[PDB]
mmCIF file of C-alpha atoms in Angstrom:
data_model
loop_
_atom_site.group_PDB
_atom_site.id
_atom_site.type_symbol
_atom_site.label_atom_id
_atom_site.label_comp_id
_atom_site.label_asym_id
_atom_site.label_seq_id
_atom_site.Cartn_x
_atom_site.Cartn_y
_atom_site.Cartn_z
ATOM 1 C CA UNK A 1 0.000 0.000 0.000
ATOM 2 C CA UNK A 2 0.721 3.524 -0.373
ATOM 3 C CA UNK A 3 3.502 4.994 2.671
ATOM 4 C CA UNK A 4 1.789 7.962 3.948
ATOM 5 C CA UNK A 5 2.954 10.269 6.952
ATOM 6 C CA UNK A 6 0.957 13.137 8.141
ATOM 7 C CA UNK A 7 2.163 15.686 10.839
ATOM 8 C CA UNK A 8 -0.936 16.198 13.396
ATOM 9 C CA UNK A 9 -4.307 14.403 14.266
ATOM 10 C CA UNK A 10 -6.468 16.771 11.706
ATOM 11 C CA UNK A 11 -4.737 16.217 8.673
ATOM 12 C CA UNK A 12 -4.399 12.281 9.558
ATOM 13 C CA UNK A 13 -8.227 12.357 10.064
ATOM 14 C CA UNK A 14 -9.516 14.085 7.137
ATOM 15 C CA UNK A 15 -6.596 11.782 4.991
ATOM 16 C CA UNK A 16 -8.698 8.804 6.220
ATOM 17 C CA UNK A 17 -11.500 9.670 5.612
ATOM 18 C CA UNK A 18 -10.638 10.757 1.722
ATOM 19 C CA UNK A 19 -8.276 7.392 2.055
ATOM 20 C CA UNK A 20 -9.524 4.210 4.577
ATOM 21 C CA UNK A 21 -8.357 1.226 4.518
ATOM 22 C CA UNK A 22 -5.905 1.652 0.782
ATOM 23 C CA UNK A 23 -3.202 3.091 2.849
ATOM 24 C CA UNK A 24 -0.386 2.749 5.327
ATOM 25 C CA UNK A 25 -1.199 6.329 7.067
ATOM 26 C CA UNK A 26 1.528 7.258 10.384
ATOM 27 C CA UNK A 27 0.946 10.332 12.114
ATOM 28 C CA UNK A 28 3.766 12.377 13.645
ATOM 29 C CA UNK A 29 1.951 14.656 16.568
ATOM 30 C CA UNK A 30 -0.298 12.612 18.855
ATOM 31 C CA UNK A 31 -4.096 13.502 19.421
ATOM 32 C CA UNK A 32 -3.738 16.522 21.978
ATOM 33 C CA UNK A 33 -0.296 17.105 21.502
ATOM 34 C CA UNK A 34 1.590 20.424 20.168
ATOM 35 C CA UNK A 35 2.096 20.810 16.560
ATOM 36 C CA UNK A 36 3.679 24.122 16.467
ATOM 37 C CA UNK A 37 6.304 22.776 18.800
ATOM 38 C CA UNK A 38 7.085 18.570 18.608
ATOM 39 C CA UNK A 39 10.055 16.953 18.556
ATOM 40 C CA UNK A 40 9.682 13.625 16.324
ATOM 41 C CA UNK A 41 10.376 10.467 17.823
ATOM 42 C CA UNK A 42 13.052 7.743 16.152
ATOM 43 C CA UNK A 43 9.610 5.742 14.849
ATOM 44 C CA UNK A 44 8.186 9.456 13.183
ATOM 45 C CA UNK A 45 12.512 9.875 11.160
ATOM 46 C CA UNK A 46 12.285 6.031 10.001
ATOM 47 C CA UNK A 47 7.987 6.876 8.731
ATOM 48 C CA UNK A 48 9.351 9.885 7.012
ATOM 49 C CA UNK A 49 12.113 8.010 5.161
ATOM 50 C CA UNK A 50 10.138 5.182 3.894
ATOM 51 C CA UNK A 51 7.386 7.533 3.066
ATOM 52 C CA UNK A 52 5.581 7.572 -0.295
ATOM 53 C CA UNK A 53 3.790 10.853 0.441
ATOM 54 C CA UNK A 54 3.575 13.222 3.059
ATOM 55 C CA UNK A 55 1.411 15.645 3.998
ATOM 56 C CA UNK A 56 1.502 18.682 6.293
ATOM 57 C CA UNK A 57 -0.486 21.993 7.065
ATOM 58 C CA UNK A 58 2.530 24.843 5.901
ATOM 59 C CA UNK A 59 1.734 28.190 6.823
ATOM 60 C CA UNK A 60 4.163 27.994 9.238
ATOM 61 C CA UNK A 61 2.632 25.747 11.826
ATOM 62 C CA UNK A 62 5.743 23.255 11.601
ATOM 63 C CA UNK A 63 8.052 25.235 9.756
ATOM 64 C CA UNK A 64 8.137 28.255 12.223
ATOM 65 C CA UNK A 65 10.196 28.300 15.766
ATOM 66 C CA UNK A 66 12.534 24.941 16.097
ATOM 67 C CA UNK A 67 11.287 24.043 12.419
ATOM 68 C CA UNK A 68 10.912 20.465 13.068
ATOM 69 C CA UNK A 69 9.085 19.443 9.774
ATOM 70 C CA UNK A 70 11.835 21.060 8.180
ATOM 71 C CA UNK A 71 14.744 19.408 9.459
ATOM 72 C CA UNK A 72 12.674 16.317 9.390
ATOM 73 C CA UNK A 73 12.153 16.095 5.357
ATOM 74 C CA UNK A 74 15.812 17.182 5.160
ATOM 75 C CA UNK A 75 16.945 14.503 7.232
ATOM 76 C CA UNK A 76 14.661 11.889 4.894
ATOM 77 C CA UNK A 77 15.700 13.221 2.146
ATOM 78 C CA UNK A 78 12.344 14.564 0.813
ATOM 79 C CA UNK A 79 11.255 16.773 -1.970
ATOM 80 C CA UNK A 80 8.554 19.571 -1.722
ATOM 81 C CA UNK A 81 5.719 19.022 -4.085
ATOM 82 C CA UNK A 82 6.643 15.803 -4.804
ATOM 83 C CA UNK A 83 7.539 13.886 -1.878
ATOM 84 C CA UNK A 84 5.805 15.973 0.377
ATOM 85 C CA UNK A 85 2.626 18.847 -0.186
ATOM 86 C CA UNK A 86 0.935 21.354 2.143
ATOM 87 C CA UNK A 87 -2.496 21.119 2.712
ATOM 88 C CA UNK A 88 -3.500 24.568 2.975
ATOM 89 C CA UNK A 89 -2.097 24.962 -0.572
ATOM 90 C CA UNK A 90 -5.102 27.416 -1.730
ATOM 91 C CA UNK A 91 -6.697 28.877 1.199
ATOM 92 C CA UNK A 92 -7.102 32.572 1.604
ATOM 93 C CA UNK A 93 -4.359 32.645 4.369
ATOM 94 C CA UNK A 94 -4.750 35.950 6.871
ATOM 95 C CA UNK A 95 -1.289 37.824 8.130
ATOM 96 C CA UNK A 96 -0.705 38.197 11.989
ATOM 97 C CA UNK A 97 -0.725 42.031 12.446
ATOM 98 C CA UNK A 98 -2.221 42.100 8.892
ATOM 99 C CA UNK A 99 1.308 42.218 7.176
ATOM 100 C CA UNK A 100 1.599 40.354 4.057
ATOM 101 C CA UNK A 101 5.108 38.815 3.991
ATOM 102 C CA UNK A 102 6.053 35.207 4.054
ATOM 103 C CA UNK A 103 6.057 33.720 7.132
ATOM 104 C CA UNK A 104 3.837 35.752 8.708
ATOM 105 C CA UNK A 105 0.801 33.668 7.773
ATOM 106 C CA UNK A 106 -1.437 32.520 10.584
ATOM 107 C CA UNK A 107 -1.539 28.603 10.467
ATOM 108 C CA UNK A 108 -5.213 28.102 11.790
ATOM 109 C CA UNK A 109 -6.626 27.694 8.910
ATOM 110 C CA UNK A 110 -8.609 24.726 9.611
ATOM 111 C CA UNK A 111 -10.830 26.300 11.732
ATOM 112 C CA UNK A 112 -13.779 27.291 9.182
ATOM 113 C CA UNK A 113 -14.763 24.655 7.112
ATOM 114 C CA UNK A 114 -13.934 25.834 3.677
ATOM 115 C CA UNK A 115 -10.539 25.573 4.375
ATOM 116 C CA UNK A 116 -11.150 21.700 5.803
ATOM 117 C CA UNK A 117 -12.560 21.118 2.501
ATOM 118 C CA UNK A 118 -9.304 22.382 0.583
ATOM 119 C CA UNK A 119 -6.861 20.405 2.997
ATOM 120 C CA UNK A 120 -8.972 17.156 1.834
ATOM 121 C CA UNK A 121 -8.704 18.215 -2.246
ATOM 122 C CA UNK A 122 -5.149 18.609 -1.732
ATOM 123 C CA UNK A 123 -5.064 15.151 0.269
ATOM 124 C CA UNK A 124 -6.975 13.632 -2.523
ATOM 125 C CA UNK A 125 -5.456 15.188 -5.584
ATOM 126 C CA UNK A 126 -1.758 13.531 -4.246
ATOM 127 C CA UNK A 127 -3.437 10.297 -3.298
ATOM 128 C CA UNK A 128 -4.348 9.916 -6.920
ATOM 129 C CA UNK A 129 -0.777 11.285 -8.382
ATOM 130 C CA UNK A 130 0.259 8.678 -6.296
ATOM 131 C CA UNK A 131 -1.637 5.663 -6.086
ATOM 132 C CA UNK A 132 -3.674 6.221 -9.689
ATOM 133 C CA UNK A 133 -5.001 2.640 -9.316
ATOM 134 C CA UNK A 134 -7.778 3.950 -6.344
ATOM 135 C CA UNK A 135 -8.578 7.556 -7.912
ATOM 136 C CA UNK A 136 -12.296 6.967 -8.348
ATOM 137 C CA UNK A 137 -12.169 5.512 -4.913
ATOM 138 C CA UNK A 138 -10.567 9.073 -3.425
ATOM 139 C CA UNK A 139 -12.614 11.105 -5.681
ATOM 140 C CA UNK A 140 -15.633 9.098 -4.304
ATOM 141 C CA UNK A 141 -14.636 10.042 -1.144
ATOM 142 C CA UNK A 142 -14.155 13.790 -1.168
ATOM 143 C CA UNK A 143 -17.099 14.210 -3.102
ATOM 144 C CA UNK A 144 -18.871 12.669 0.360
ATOM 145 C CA UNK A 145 -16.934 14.243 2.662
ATOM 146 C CA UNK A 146 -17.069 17.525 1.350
ATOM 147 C CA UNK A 147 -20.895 17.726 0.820
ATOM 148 C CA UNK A 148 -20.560 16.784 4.530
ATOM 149 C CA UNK A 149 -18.670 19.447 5.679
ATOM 150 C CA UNK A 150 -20.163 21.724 3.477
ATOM 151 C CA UNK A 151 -23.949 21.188 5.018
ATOM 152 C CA UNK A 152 -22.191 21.822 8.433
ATOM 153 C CA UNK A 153 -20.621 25.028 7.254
ATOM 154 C CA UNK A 154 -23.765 26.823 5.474
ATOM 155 C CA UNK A 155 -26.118 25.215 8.480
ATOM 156 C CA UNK A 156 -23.608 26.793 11.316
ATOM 157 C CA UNK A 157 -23.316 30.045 9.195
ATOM 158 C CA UNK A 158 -27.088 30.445 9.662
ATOM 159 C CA UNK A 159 -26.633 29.716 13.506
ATOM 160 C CA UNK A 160 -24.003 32.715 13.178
ATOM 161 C CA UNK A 161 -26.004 35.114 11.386
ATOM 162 C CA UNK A 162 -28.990 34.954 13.903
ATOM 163 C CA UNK A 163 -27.225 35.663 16.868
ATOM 164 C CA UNK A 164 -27.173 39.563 17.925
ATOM 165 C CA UNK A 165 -24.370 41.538 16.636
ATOM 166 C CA UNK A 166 -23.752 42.891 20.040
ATOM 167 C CA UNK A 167 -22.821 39.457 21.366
ATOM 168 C CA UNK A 168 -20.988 37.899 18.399
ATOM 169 C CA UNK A 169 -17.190 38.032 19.856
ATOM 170 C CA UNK A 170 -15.060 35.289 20.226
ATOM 171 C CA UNK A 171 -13.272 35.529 22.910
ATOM 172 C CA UNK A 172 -9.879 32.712 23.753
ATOM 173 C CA UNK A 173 -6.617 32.435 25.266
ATOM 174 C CA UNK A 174 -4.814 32.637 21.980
ATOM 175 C CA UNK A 175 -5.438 34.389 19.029
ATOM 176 C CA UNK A 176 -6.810 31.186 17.071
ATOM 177 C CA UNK A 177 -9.462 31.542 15.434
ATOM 178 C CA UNK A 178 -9.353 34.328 12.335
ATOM 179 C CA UNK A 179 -10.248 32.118 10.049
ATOM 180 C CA UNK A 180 -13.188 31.315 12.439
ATOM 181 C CA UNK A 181 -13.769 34.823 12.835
ATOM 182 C CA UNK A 182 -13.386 35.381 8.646
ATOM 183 C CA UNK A 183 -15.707 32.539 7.253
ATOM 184 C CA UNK A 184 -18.708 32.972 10.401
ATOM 185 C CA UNK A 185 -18.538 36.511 11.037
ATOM 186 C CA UNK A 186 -17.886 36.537 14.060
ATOM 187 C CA UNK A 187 -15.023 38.935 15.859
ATOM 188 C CA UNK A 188 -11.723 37.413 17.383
ATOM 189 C CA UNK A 189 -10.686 39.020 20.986
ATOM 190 C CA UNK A 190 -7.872 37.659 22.915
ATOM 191 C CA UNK A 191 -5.217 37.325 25.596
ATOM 192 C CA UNK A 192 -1.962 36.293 23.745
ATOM 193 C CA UNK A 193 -1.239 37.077 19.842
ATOM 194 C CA UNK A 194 0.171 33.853 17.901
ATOM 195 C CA UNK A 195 3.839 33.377 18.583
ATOM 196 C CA UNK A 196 3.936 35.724 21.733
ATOM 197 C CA UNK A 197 6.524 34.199 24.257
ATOM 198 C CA UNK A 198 4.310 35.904 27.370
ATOM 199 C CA UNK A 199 1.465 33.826 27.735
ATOM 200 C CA UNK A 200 -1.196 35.438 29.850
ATOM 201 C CA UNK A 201 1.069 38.141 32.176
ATOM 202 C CA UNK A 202 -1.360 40.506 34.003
ATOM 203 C CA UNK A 203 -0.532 43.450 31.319
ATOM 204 C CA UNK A 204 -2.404 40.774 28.688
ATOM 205 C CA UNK A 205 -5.013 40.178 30.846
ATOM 206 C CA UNK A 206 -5.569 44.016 31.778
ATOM 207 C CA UNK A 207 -6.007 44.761 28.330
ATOM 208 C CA UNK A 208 -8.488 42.478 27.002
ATOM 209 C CA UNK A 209 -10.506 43.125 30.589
ATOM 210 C CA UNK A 210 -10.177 46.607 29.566
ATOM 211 C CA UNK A 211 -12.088 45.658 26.371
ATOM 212 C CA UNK A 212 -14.146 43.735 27.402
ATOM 213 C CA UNK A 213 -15.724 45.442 29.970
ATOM 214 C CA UNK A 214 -16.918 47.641 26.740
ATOM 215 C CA UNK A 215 -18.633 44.892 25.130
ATOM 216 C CA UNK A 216 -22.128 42.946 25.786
ATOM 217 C CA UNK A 217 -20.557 40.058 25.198
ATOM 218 C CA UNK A 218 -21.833 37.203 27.556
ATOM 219 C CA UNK A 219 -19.514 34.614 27.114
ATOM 220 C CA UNK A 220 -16.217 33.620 27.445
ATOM 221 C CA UNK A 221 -14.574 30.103 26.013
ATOM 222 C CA UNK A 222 -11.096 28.426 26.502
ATOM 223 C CA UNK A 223 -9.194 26.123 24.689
ATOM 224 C CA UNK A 224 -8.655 22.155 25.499
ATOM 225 C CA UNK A 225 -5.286 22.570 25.399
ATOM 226 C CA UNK A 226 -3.717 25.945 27.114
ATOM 227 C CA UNK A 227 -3.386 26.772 30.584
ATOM 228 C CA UNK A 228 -6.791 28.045 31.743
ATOM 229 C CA UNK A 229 -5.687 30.173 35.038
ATOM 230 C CA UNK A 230 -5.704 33.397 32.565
ATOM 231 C CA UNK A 231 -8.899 33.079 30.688
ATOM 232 C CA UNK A 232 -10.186 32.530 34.458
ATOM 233 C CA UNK A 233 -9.035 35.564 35.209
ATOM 234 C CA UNK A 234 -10.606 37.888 32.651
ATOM 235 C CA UNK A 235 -13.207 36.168 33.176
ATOM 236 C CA UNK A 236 -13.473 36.854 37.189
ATOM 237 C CA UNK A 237 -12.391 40.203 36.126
ATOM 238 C CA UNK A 238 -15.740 40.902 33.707
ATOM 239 C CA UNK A 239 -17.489 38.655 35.284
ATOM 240 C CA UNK A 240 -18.181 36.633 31.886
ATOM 241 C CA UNK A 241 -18.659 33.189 32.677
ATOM 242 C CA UNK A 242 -16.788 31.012 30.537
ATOM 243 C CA UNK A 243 -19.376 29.005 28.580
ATOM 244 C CA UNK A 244 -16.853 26.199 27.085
ATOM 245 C CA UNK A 245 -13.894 24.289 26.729
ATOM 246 C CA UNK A 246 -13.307 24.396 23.035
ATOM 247 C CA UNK A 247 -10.786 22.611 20.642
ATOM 248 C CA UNK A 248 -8.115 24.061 18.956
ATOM 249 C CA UNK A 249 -5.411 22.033 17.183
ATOM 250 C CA UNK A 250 -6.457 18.775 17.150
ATOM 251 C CA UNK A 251 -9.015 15.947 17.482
ATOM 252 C CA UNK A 252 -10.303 14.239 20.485
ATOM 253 C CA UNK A 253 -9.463 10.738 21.655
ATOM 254 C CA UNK A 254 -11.108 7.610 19.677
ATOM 255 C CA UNK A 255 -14.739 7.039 21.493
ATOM 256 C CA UNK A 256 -14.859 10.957 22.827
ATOM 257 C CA UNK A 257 -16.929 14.044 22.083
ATOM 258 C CA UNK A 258 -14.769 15.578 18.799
ATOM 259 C CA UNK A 259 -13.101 12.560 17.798
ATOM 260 C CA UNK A 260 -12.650 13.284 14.042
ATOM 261 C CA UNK A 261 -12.086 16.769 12.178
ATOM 262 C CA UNK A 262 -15.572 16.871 11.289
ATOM 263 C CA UNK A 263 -16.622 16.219 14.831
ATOM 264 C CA UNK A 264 -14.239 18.466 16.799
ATOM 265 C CA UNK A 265 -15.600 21.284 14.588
ATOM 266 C CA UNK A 266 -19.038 20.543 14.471
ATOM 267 C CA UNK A 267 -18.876 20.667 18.889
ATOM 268 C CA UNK A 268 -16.933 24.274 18.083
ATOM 269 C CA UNK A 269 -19.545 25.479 16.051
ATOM 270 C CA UNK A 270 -22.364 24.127 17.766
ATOM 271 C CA UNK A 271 -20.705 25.633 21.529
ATOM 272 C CA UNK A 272 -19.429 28.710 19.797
ATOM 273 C CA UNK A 273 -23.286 29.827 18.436
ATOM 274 C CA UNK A 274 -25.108 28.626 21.949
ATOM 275 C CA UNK A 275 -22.668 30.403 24.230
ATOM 276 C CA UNK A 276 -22.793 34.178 22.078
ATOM 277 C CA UNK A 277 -26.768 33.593 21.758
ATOM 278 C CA UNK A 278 -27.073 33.702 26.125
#
């Protein structure tokens, strides 16, 4: 079967569901894990090397900081856009601080469903460069998949565009979710930009409090997998109870609540719409 690699939970998950069984699929970052900042394993090098194709966000999720996919497909001797392709390849990417130069790009770009559906044509186009004998097979497969996020994306866009404008804010630890904020409509506020090294000192907290306390909005969320002590503490501070624990960069575990890309977003969407609308 076809060698394939993938770097985090997400991609893995949307490159079975495009793939199943026809594959030998390894991922690199464990569900719940980091995958801004991993260091692969011995078993993740000798998966690389023997890889047929591999596949990983870009936008400098794991290119950015220590680098590690970088030195990885060095190491295994891999070739961009042959042995290995990004999935975000298409999106409309967003700039932190709105400055369009490369590596700047914010790598969340997962987080509204259009962009889900491009990871999985990129993950399908390469399967079938690759492995030509199951094409209809993959093409089969996105065509499901993507009518299945797209009915999630137009029916949680509707959810959006209900709720009063003077509560839509979304409100997190990190700064996230623009591409949340871009596709739904709904305003990003935070504690801590992307790449800060400060995460959550009291002059971060101060200022969002500061903003907040200007708002109507009447709920707070935090992510799965940062510290929550600060987002307590705004929220103590506005006294805006924090509706939800919400997911960020990856899936849950097999058997829970958000255990597949489709899932982990469709529990963000769904939490997301009923904490703004209190």
């Amino acid at each position: 079967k076809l060698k394939v690699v993938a770097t985090n939970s997400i991609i893995a998950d949307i490159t079975k569901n495009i793939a199943g069984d026809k594959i030998d699929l390894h991922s690199i970052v464990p569900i719940g894990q980091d995958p801004h900042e991993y260091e692969p394993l011995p078993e993740d090098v000798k998966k690389t090397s023997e890889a047929d194709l591999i596949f990983y966000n870009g936008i400098n999720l794991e290119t950015g900081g220590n680098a590690w996919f970088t030195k990885l497909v060095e190491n295994a001797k891999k070739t961009e856009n042959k042995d290995y392709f990004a999935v975000s390849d298409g999106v409309d990417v967003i700039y932190l601080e709105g400055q369009n130069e490369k590596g700047k790009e914010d790598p969340h770009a997962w987080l509204n469903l259009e962009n889900g559906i491009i990871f999985a044509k990129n993950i399908a186009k390469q399967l079938s460069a690759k492995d030509p004998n199951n094409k209809e097979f993959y093409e089969k497969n996105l065509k499901e998949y993507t009518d299945k996020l797209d009915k999630l994306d137009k029916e949680s866009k509707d959810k959006f565009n209900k709720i009063p404008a003077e509560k839509k804010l979304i409100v997190t630890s990190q700064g996230a979710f623009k591409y949340f904020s871009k596709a739904y409509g709904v305003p990003s506020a935070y504690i801590w930009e992307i790449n800060t090294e400060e995460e959550g000192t009291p002059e971060q907290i101060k200022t969002l409090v500061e903003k907040l306390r200007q708002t109507k909005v009447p709920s707070l969320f935090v992510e799965s997998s940062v510290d929550d002590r600060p987002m307590k503490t705004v929220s103590q501070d506005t006294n805006i109870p924090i509706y939800a624990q919400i997911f960020t960069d990856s899936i849950a575990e097999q058997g829970k609540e958000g255990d597949s890309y489709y899932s982990m977003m469709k529990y963000n969407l769904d939490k997301i719409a009923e904490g703004l609308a209190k």
